[PDB]
């Protein structure tokens, strides 16, 4: 997704609220980096580190399936039309092609004379 | 409180107190198993088994049919007009309807 102008450096102000906003971002950034620094720079470890953020990322798709979906609303029915719907779409495509083929075999032959495979 | 739950420890053979091995513990068991009988199946099933597969014992009339067809072609060409197929396994059937 893209707008009329690409967002990279558009609309920026110093102010007072924005100055403290960058201070909030660096506070968590440095906190999570130092616990990595204490784990990386020692020979006593030998192994793969866990990281709680990455495990929760995999847990977002593998789990949290049935805890969700409790508000179905009209959004779930629209997804059903995009799933079960296209299965019924080809039913009026493959049958019409087969009825076109079956009529040709009995009357007015269309199949090639040099055909033997299957 | 966990009491007795904490017991998990990382374990790897790698090279330490093993030199170069695949089997866990004992150098005598490793050499005789992981390199001898592990590769004996590599020599009998793969190398000596390559002679079979489909090559040698004919395998469901693949080579037999070629010799059978050629003699039937030359016989039917000299005497008859129709080549092989005309009426397959049908000679005087007792009506239809």
């Amino acid at each position: 997704x893209x707008x009329x102008x690409x967002x990279x450096x558009x609309x920026x102000x110093x102010x007072x609220x924005x100055x403290x906003x960058q201070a909030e971002r660096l506070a968590i950034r440095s906190r999570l980096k130092r616990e990595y620094q204490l784990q990386y720079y020692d020979p006593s470890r030998r192994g793969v580190i866990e990281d709680p953020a990455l495990v929760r990322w995999t847990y977002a798709r593998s789990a949290n399936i049935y805890p969700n979906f409790r508000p179905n609303t009209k959004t779930s029915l629209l997804g059903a039309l995009f799933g079960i719907g296209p299965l019924v779409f080809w039913y009026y495509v493959f049958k019409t092609d087969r009825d076109r083929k079956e009529k040709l075999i009995q009357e007015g032959k269309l199949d090639r004379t040099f055909n033997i495979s299957y | 409180r966990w009491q007795e739950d904490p017991e998990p420890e990382d374990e790897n053979l790698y090279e330490k107190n093993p030199d170069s091995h695949g089997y866990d513990k004992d150098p005598a068991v490793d050499i005789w198993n992981m390199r001898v009988v592990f590769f004996f199946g590599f020599s009998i099933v793969l190398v000596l088994g390559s002679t079979f597969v489909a090559y040698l014992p004919d395998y469901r009339m693949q080579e037999w049919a070629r010799r059978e067809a050629e003699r039937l072609v030359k016989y039917r060409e000299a005497h008859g007009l129709p080549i092989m197929e005309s009426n397959c396994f049908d000679p005087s059937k007792i009506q239809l309807p």
Binding site: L54, R61, D97, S117, Y118 | V37, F38, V45, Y59, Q62
Partner: protein, 457 residues
């Protein structure tokens, strides 16, 4: 000749001393697998019966050889696991594989449907105990219950199906006797007769609907990776679809028409999910759905060309997916997590295993004629004789077949590995031997694929 030496593996593991075990179980199994190729391959015009109806001959089943091929291979990758625990526990879960091997031989050999059924569901019992134990991650039971309540819910209707046939039309038994079978008149009472025979094999051979049986079994790993090869054997273990469709219902293909359309959408939608997924084992689990979906399409066409592609794909997938799971196990034993993004680094840390990663991935695509080109392409050629529209849908699937393999490669072909400190030794002598024992049998099938596809070939 086949059964009895397989049964003698049970007293072999128990009588042998605690220091050995693994040496005896692997070496003795390899010489029995050599003798299976020695005798079973011989056949005439129509394959003549072996002996009395207990275990019979093979007509269109070179798939028994694959079970004999994995017979030692289901012990090689499980060596990294089980070693930490008790010596009695080691012997138990080798004998559960022996029991699996005992029942899996019986399914493919015995030319039956009545006694075949009590061997079809009999494979589920040893695998259940295998899955419900040794699982490193949780939800073993949310996969173990789903393992049975998908299969047994569909397969128990065979009791009301198969017995109903033999009570009216002679007897099922030999299949070589089965020419008493008259074509079905096609009525509303005959609908549930066809469905009950199909729904049993609609679960083991995964579609678009009722397909969630398979990913739960793969993601929640039983033991290491060698038991996942037995889960591949269960997919091809439902081979009776080759036998039922040809013999029991020859005139019935009008009711097959909606089931082809279900499996046709189980090719685009099953492949699309197999792209953005996190787990390395899951990206093999969903590609195995679509690869076995190709076989289900081929069966329901009933053309002589399609069965050639069907029988080929049973052996093709049985040694390519199992090869991919061994590569997934080799990363699971070092990194201790099945995450694709975290476990990143080939060639730099794994120099020789990366070439095995390439050969396994490209075999999913249509390479120079190994087995998958004789497998996949034969089905696509046969679908055009059914309907002209098929290749428009089937061609899109051929694009995403690369998107299973290459996405598994690229997301591991980055030589960063900043967070990872483990995986010092690239591969043990047994670990590299596993990778060779899967591809090199397929490389020998390049010369003669007659023993890879043979229903009247």
């Amino acid at each position: 000749k086949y059964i009895i030496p397989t049964i003698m593996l049970m007293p072999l593991t128990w009588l042998s001393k605690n220091n050995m075990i693994w040496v005896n179980s692997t070496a003795h199994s390899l010489l029995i697998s050599f003798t299976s190729l020695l005798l079973m391959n011989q056949f005439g015009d129509n394959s003549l019966n072996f002996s009395l109806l207990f275990f019979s001959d093979s007509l269109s089943t070179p798939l028994l050889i694959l079970t004999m091929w994995l017979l030692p291979l289901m012990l090689m990758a499980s060596q990294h696991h089980l070693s930490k625990e008790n010596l009695t526990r080691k012997k138990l879960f080798i004998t559960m594989l022996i029991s699996l091997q005992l029942f899996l031989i019986m399914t493919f050999t015995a030319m039956e449907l009545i006694l075949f059924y009590i061997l079809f569901e009999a494979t589920l019992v040893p695998t259940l105990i295998i899955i419900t134990r040794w699982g490193n991650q949780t939800e073993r039971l949310n996969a173990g219950l789903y393992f049975l309540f998908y299969t047994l819910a569909g397969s128990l209707p065979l009791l009301v199906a198969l017995i109903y046939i033999q009570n009216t039309v002679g007897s099922l038994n030999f299949l070589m006797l089965q020419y008493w079978v008259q074509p079905v008149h096609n009525s509303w009472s005959n609908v549930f007769m066809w469905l009950a025979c199909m729904m049993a094999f609609m679960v083991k051979m995964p579609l678009y609907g009722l397909h969630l049986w398979l990913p739960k079994a793969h993601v929640e790993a039983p033991i290491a990776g060698s038991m996942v090869l037995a889960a591949v054997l269960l997919k091809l273990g439902g081979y009776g679809m080759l036998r039922i469709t040809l013999i029991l219902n020859p005139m019935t293909d009008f009711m097959a028409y909606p089931f082809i359309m279900l499996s046709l959408w189980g090719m685009i939608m099953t492949s699309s999910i197999c792209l953005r997924q996190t787990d390395l084992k899951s990206l093999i689990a969903y590609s195995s759905v679509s690869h076995m979906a190709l076989v289900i399409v081929a069966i329901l066409i009933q053309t002589p060309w399609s069965y050639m592609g069907a029988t080929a794909l049973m052996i093709a997938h049985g040694l390519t997916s199992s090869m991919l799971f061994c590569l997934a196990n080799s990363n699971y034993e070092r990194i201790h997590s099945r995450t694709m993004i975290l476990a990143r680094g080939l060639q730099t840390l794994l120099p020789l295993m990366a070439t095995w990663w390439l050969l396994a991935s490209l075999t999913n695509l249509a390479l120079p004629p190994t087995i998958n080109l004789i497998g996949e392409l034969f089905v696509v050629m046969s679908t055009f004789s059914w309907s002209n529209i098929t290749i428009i849908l089937m061609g899109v699937n051929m694009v995403i077949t690369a998107l299973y393999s290459l996405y598994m490669l690229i997301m591991t072909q980055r030589g960063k590995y900043t967070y990872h400190i483990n995986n010092i030794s690239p591969s043990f002598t047994r670990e590299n031997a596993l990778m060779s024992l899967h591809i090199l049998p397929l490389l020998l099938l390049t010369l003669n694929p007659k023993i890879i596809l043979g229903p009247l070939y």
